[PDB]
Subunit: 333 residues, 4 copies
């Protein structure tokens, strides 16, 4: 059926595997040049933020075995050398962060991948946010695709609802974001992101993200109407979007919440959720949604100028969307 | 000369004492119903975020002795019972957070305080931000005063510059704020701020603040043009203001930075500072400024819609302003 | 059958309720003077370290409703005024930390509690560690009992195995322990534990515990042979015991691990667990065991002098034991 | 006079530079293949744990300029290619962690370094702890030397005092240690230290250290009498030694503290310090001592079996000793 190969067994690769297991999608191979099979077992079995894997994990004859599913493993430094074609022609999830362009990722294709999903923004690959524009995917012309960013996946669904109901004249986004693997435990080297080299654990760290502007790629009507930035703070997971926007049509705060509520119950079900509870970040650790609107946290200056709040599990929600995109793409073959 | 009595030996009271020592202002008494003199020594001598006191601290004959300065100590539960009049008639810094109204704080006056500064917003007491409106202080009519909040003290100076140069049509503020003493180490009781009861250390915690709106009290032209909210995050000190505003007159980002730069060098010197360095929060721990503009962290969508970033040491900067206000008030007797 | 009333809805009270639900023990009432029913719902529904409650929680007609179980709620400041006798005569779990002595806790009895388990060490109430000395419980004479401390519950089972196999001549314990509700977010007041007032999140904090010595109360042969202390560190949950002991009979490290392994598989199953994996603290969050021996972390200088390591979820493991003690006590009526 | 070149501008290299400035030792060059001069300025100027550099730092003409001292900079990947001989023949501090053996470090020598101090334990280079065995240094035969580890530098001075006064029959050490640059922000790859790959900020992490055993290299009478291990915890700096030892001669706890006190006031002044205050870890951030004995934190089971506690700033204290070792070595030329 749908079969999946994963390149890179970092945080995304591992959670993607977990999600595939949960959604019953067959993973046929994992490739990582650095992480051997016995070590894969350990990294998958135990997880500091998401807990122990709820099934069984073992290594056998150079294979990763998860709940009796035997998964091939490779240690190729070059995508070109991965034998995708010898193990069916799976969809490939590209999680290394190193092959973002269509040209770079196309290496997978030449080695036998039927299609490729890049788990990061791409300079040129078509970008998709489930619930927003996946229907623009076209199998006739799109062999390599991007699932955008965790952040864009949180903001876009919310921007869609607000724009379609009220009209976003212009918006500026801040994401208060958990620290990540690219960061440092103590002040260390990060030569093209100096602030990002500073102790992740000790600091609030300003960061530049194209995540808000990129919404204009999945919602063309918003091109040039959004940008923003980030603060990385000392939490290990879960992040929050803080969107300040001016609306075309005037909207009471209650009209806004009612619109979001309706979207969550209906067309954006499973993508955008809604809460009125007095929640905090940990309440969304392990939440599969792309975006959870926080009604009570937001505030309006007036009917045309408002600040909207939405939570996202930047690891798990995004990983869930990657698998959702694979499934959708496959339904379109 | 100017003499100072301090009520409450919590974080603010202790740093205020430290600042008084640093600026050579004589503190004649500290009152706290709970913290005995020997314990005062310990709490003042050692500080997890601001380091050890750089001088000497001892207890002797029921007095706190700091760098040979003998300071009286009291343990009164009721301001009315504090013998201010018997030890000169000092200005009193009210740091308990419990006597915010003019009526409540007036207890100090009836017991002999010449004037009172409330180290928190007040329902009715006149509110002042040094560098913004202290000149509206009037000794003929104002015996009880408020130094506003740490947050308002960061935002107001910046809002002044932006408004006076370009005009703020409307603005929405978010402060990413370090956790505080009102918070909890683990999920515990906070019955009129449920989110604030959740583990401070584990969570990004949305919080409601009137700090942005209160800017309209010190800058009347901005009444009704500002509001905002907060996220409390797992850092012990230093916070950051994130102001999204629409400007009347169009302003390039460089025009904005040049205006702020000029204010810092001139009329707002010692209050508002300016940086273009790749800074993070810890870089401002122990900074005495009310607000440090971060040129490179901010971002503009266009000449009329911008997001501006300013740092503040919510403990030390504010404590410095409290003492500055005392000194100014005294210069006006 | 067995029915349970819980006094105090703090971390222990809440997890005890959770465990009772999990093990099918009927809780008939919760008393807390400060936490109202609607707030109880919130505190139980969401948990920063243990995640959302996996069932349903609502408030109705002054009752807490958990998975359709209607639970009475009270707000009595005095145990004497709690109507235990009016709702059957349940076993009472005393979790406030305020009524530790037999005399203080007996208030529950006079108001109708059939028996009382104090979830903390008691100056005089008989103390029990499941798997070690519960069989010494006697329903004829013991109406008020203590479940000791989390720490003692981790150390005692391990000490039992080591003593019975090899003989502990003497031992010194350090527990590296997560911060707790008694600690402070920032340097604040703690007049009979000065170090414990210091910022929990910023500091390694030495602490005095009678937990190791108290093992001599549940294992009489070890009276006078054990003591120790603690370091509180910036983790929200899960702790670790570090036991340095001299052995009577010489024991290779492999002999030691084999003994612990056998104990875990057999007589101490469900109390003591055993691992040889490369684990860290988060791997034991939500673990119900009293003690998980870490084979590879320990180290021996020689056959008679060794350092042994055992993990414990100081919240959940202990809460499980409280309920286990209730069940055992009931089987003895 | 004494001139110093530093290889590697990581945490140690930077603090060593800071210390050299403070103690008036001339640093003539810094080499780092990755960190360019402009970036060096930034990394030295700002420090998350130790605060901003208290002087001036600039880059000019490929030179690092600190308080008007012009320092050469190089970007050589191979020690052999560093022009030590062209800039006098300085002592070289080897801080990369990559050239630990006499053979590897000798590359510095062949390129003109007069002597080399390795800022880490070495498989074969003579190891020194200031205050313990520096007098065994011999310039006739020792061109390459090691300053041992931060941990060994904390334990050895304390062990010396205890052994010389009472006799250590055997001891087991635990160090509760702050996380370091080798650790990871979130669960990531660490193939020869699996536990050390786990999130540093979320976890208590058991770690194997030869630091206690290595004391037998600087105090020969203790060879085979000491070993231990570590727990890495979520603090950015400052660590603590927890030494459990059996004594030959019986010693009251007061006898022990009196011995340490006398050692600190006399022969080990500037190396070992002594406190009876209710201290916590942050109280020692920026402390230059190798070891600060904590009298009140320790505990004795009896006169021959005791647990002793000593703090160390694992970054700054060690860096100070490196420079002290350089100075001592030079006094011996």
């Amino acid at each position: 059926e749908l079969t999946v190969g994963i390149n890179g067994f970092g945080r995304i690769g591992r959670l993607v595997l977990r999600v595939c297991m949960e959604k019953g999608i067959r993973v046929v191979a994992v490739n990582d040049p650095f992480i051997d099979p016995e070590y894969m077992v350990y990294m998958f079995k135990y997880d500091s933020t998401h807990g122990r894997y709820k099934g069984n994990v073992e290594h056998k004859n150079g294979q990763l075995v998860v709940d009796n599913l035997e998964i091939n493993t490779y240690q190729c430094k070059d995508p070109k050398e991965i034998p995708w074609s010898s193990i069916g022609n799976p969809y490939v999830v590209e999680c290394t962060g190193v092959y973002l362009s269509i040209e770079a990722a196309s290496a997978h294709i030449s080695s036998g991948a039927r299609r490729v999903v890049v788990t990061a923004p791409s300079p040129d690959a078509p970008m998709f946010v489930m619930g927003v524009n996946e229907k623009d995917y076209n199998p006739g012309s799109m062999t390599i695709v991007s699932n955008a960013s965790c952040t864009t996946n949180c903001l876009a669904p919310l921007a869609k609802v607000i724009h379609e109901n009220f009209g976003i004249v212009e918006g500026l986004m801040t994401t208060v974001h958990s620290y990540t693997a690219t960061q440092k435990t103590v002040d260390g080297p990060s030569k093209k992101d100096w602030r990002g080299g500073r102790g992740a654990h000790q600091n609030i760290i300003p960061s530049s993200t194209g995540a808000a502007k990129a919404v204009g790629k999945v919602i063309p009507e918003l091109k040039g109407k959004l940008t923003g930035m980030a603060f990385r703070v000392p939490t290990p997971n879960v992040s929050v979007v803080d969107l300040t926007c001016r609306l075309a049509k005037p909207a009471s705060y209650s009209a806004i919440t009612e619109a979001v509520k309706a979207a969550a119950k209906g067309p954006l079900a499973g993508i955008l959720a809604y809460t009125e509870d007095q929640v905090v970040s940990t309440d969304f650790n392990g939440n599969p949604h792309s975006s959870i609107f926080d009604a009570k946290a937001g505030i309006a200056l007036n009917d045309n100028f408002v600040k909207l709040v939405a939570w996202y599990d930047n690891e798990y929600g995004y990983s869930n969307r990657v698998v959702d995109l694979l499934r959708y793409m496959f339904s379109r073959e």
